[PDB]
Symmetry: C3
Subunit: 109 residues, 3 copies
């Protein structure tokens, strides 16, 4: 999967977490968010198509994706510990990380 398909996966799974009821649904959705990021970890946004891999603008995209996967992992642990509301609260703070990362590298759509 390319970049902007995994970003829409993240956004949609965040909507599943809000409408969740138990720890299984949120943990499942969170793992899908972790899954999507790893399959698209090596993907490239449409903006940074012709940018060099060693460019400061591209590596700043790589650390932001690594940061995104780091907040996902922390929310996964809270859901794995049976704390549904402590994780859903972390998924809300995660949403502002997915959103900021998305429009910064979106194709202006």
């Amino acid at each position: 999967a390319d970049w902007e398909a995994a970003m829409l996966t993240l956004l949609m799974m965040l909507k599943v977490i809000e409408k969740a009821d138990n720890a299984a649904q949120v943990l499942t959705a969170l793992w899908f968010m972790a899954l999507a990021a790893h399959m698209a970890a090596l993907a490239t946004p449409p903006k940074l198509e012709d940018k060099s891999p060693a460019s400061p603008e591209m590596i700043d995209f790589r650390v932001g994706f690594e940061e995104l996967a780091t907040e996902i992992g922390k929310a996964i642990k809270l859901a794995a510990l049976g704390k549904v509301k402590e994780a859903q609260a972390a998924a809300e703070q995660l949403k502002t990380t997915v959103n900021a990362h998305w429009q910064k590298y979106r194709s202006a759509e």
Copy 2:
């Protein structure tokens, strides 16, 4: 997971996509198809057990698996865009790619 277990996962998830109702179920099943392929990306079919990795018959299996993951990624994006029928139509064309790849490297079962 070995090769023919992930191929049965693909086949079963295609059946889930036909019986889906919303974008969440098809996107989830599609990501499972992408998941299965990556975990079995380095797997080897029972036929090509003793074939050399640089053999033309083996590399042709590798590019076909890469092609399979490429059609999955495209169907994932259509489901991520909320187009359930545009993606289910792509999952049907994907089914003929999973089927052709399966029996070509199946253990004649």
Copy 3:
């Protein structure tokens, strides 16, 4: 995801397999167990924080995680073949592998 979050994912998915009804639910949960292990394949338990990577105590943790992913893959194939009870029986023997691996490297909690 770190180590003890993926181990709780494994434990919770085993509980989903017991409460499953069809091949889709068990195969899905099993793939989540395979997923969790690959994302945490390079993770480090809290005990082995300061141990060297070439230490016998650390490599013994690596082969045990590889063994864990091997039993998961075999249970995935049984669920992929439509054998729900043959796989749920394998998931029960898998549970004693997840449990033994968990408390051996748990942070004494």
